[PDB]
Amino acid sequence: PVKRRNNGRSKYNCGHTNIVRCQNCHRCVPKDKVIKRFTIRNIVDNTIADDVLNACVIQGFAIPKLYNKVQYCVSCSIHNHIVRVRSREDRKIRTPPK
Amino acid sequence: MRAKWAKKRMRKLKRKRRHMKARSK
Amino acid sequence: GKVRTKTIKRAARKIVENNYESLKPKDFQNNKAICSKRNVAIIPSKRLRNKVAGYVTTLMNRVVKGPVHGISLRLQEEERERRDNYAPKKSEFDVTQQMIDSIGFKCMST
RNA sequence: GGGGACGGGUGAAACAGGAUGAUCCCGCCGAGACCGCCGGCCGCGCAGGCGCCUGCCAAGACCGCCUCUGUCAAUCAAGGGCGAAGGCCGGGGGCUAGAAGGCGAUCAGACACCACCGUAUUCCCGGCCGUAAACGGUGCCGCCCCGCGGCCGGCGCGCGCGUCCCGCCGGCCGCCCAGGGAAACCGGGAGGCUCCGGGCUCUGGGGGGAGUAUGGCCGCAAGGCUGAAACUUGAAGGCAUUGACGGAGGGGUACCACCAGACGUGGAGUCUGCGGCUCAAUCUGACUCAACGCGCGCACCUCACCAGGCCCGGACGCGCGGAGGACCGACAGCCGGGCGCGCUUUCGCGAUCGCGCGGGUGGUGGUGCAUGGCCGCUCCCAGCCCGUGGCGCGAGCCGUCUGCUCCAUUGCGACAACGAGCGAGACCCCGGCCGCGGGCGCCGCGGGACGGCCCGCGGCAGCGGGAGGACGGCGGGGCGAUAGCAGGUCUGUGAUGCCCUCAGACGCCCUGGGCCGCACGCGCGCUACACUGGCGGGGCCAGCCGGCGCCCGCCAGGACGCGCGGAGCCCCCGCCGUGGCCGGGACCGCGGGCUGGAACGCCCCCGCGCACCAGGAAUGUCUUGUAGGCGCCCGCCCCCACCGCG
């Protein structure tokens, strides 16, 4: 039967969306059916962050942040645990965890 | 995709049957 | 370390409310003697009695400091009732304008 | 140009790339594709579809409206146009990726997945094709219908005045009251429907055969469209519930699992089972865990098997016969290991009854898949479930928890559940410690310990330590839920259905022999491979629990008596001394004992002196008095343990 009302993709008022490539698996997934998680990590590791600042000659230097959007396919996401198989009731919960 | 592979096998056999009729008539 | 069984736990809660005056909070030996009276509590088995008496001691230290659910303290009950039946003096509670004017009461108007 | 040696690629590699300077860094140039992040429960479009900048050209829905027209409309065979991608036909163009093809791996194979190279293709223009899970798997136009939110576009109302607020209209959505439905779900319908009728078009009628065949039409082709029958079959299918499984996720948990270690097996010589072989017979049971020193010690008996033999122990009841003969016993020879067993024979004895029939009594004979009982296994599990109430048409759920805690549905905090019960715990046996009483003998009754205290951390349940204390957080055992296995036992059983047998016995005995043979394969074990050892004297230490003396014999053992009683290891001093040696003790020739009716059983003395110099691929058990080493007792038992249980 039909597991999900959205059909697993957010396609409303549309017959065709753009094609995105899963970064790990290099597959072609529609834009609506993609993980789309945006991550802002600092350029350096937080273990090496303070010692970089001490070493940095420039005063008032701010460590660069890395801004990237990681998009994955369902197979290339459930296996990396970015999304998890949920209970039928838990599946309905659309709120992001934490 | 057995059902698609079934129609690929069928098309290949109908093509052959056409060739035999082309050899005759 | 060893989780107490429901029979040991339930019995201990009944013993503590019944003998709240008799039991003392931090002494297992004093509480073992109360529990083994064959009057205020009949516990067969030396090991069962020792196990129930030890829960009772833990629960008694909880009763004196921040009491816990399942135990009925007459001493706490009277204080709770006193506040429950306490009257706050003249009651400050005794002492949207368009709505008041709509009723026509116009209380405190101007 | 610079600089110097490895780059690529993977899951790990490898094939190509490199002193003709790769990779890397920077400048610069050419080529074609493509338009990131923003980018969406945004929007637009008839669908297919649509995202660079700057113009140009024509649109479309929506909203507002006291503008015009006056039914001009709805849905639609045929007919027209459009239609992703791939394909095809001409021109181009060619950066990437990449059907084919080629390689390098993988594997049992791999011409697959993965790496690498790369043609068509991908892109544009002019056409063909006419299909997609072209999906909302939901035709179109119309009416009413229940709240609650989000977004988008236009417009109106208040209000200071804000990309507010409240509407309205159109769109896109989420939840959902009824209602519907086989349910999942739909609820802007899949509502207003067995209480059935707004209009219009299309399609289906069990599952195959088969979208096949043939005919038509269409296309350059690929193919599209229209579309059978013969014949076959009893289901195919939908949705949901429960189990089982997952190379699914999240929790846990166990030396029958691993870490970390130990101590082994496998190698060998033996002991001893199992299969195979051979037999007169080698009686059989059973075969992953959960078969294989298991069915409690096979000379006979056991013993169920083989080759001979002996009777009745066939009760009872009837027809018949019958006490001077129903029956039954035998000497001597003879045959026969043998037994009046029979025979020759010629003396005994007394219904102990004969026969026929009907009916027994048996059977270690079969069928454990006909059964009981008992045990093994799932399960060294923690789970199983009831009453009443709730939810569904129901199967079946809730309780019985996806939170935490615990050895553990062990608890706590909750909670359409609310109270219970079983298993867990408690209990029981033992041990260690302390009192009291008793005492031929250490053996009777109690206590002690509970996560109680202390410190941290935790609503809590608990958690980590510190202590004190014989003893510390399940000390070791016994008992063992629920539901099953078509596990095993009919050869333990006056347990037993049914079949077989049933005086030429499958009854029950009696002699002899096998089960113990053995080209071989395998499972427990045992002893070794030595010096931390062997060999000689000396010390001498137990416990479940337990007799001795004296004399002779090399021991083994014996005789004659009586009332009693005790280890190895290790320690100590010698010796041999790295040699298959004095390691090791398999074999094999005399001999001495024992037990029994009888050796083929066991013990012992002098020889004799096998492998094995540390065991491959594999595999098992184990966390303190544990592993391992080292003795000892008991079970079965004439004797006998390399076994089991202690």
- Residue written as token pair 């070493």: A55
What angle separates helix C46-64 from helix C28-35, to the nearest 10 degrees?
120
Q: What is the largest CA-CA distance in chain A?
A: 64
Q: Protein footprint on strand D: which nucleotides are under 7 Å from a CB?
A: 35-45, 47-51, 136-137, 171-175, 183-186, 190, 211-214, 222-224, 238-240, 248-250, 402, 405-408, 410-414, 424-428, 446-454, 460-464, 473-474
Q: What are phi and psi of C78, to 5 degrees?
A: -65, -40
The DSSP-derived string for A17-63 is: --EEE-TTT--EEESSSS--EEEEEESS-TTTHHHHHHH--STT--P
User: What amino acid is encoded at A78 in this protein?
Assistant: I
Look up residue C25 and give its amino acid. Answer: P
Q: Which two tokens stand for residue A40?
A: 């802002």
Cα–Cα distance measured from residue C105 to residue C110, given in angstroms and rounded to the nearest whole number: 13
Collapsing DSSP to helix, strand or coil, A95 comes out as coil
Check if residue C14 sits with its Cβ under 7 angstroms from strand D.
no
**Interatomic CA distance for residues C64 and A84, integer angstroms:** 47
* Exposed / middle / buried, residue C35 (Cβ in 10 Å: 0-12, 13-18, 19+): buried
Residues of each annotated binding site of A for Zn(2+): 22, 24
Host domain of residue A64: 1-96
CA–CA distance, C6 with C2 (Å, rounded to integer): 13
Element (H, E) at A66: strand A65-70
Judge whether residue C63 contacts strand D, using its CB and a 7 Å cut-off.
no
Q: Which nucleotide lies nearest residue A26, CA to C1'? A: D97
Q: Cα–Cα distance between A43 and A65 in angstroms, integer?
A: 5
Distance CA C31, CA C24 (A): 6
Stated resolution in angstroms: 3.3
Distance CA C80, CA C103 (A): 41
Q: Which residues contact C5 (CB under 8 A, 6 or more apart)?
A: C51
DSSP string, C68-100: -TT---HHHHHHHHHHHT---TT-GGG--HHHH
C76 beta carbon to strand D: under 7 Å: no
* Token pair of C93 as six digits: 């509670």
The rounded radius of gyration (Å) of the Cα atoms in chain B is 11
Q: Are A42 and A75 in contact (CB under 8 A)?
A: no
Q: Which residues of B12-23 are buried (b: 16+ CB within 10 A; e: fewer)?
A: eeeeeeeeeeee
Residues 6+ positions from A41 with CB-CB distance below 8 Å: A65, A66, A68
Tokens of C99: 């709505």
Quick count: other Cβ atoms within 10 Å of Cβ C30?
15
DSSP state of A89: H
What is the residue whose two structure tokens read 């002492």?
C95
Q: Long-range contacts for C37-40 (Cβ within 8 Å, ≥24 apart)?
A: C40/C15
Q: How many domains, chain A?
A: 1
In contact, A11 and A61? CB cutoff 8 Å: no
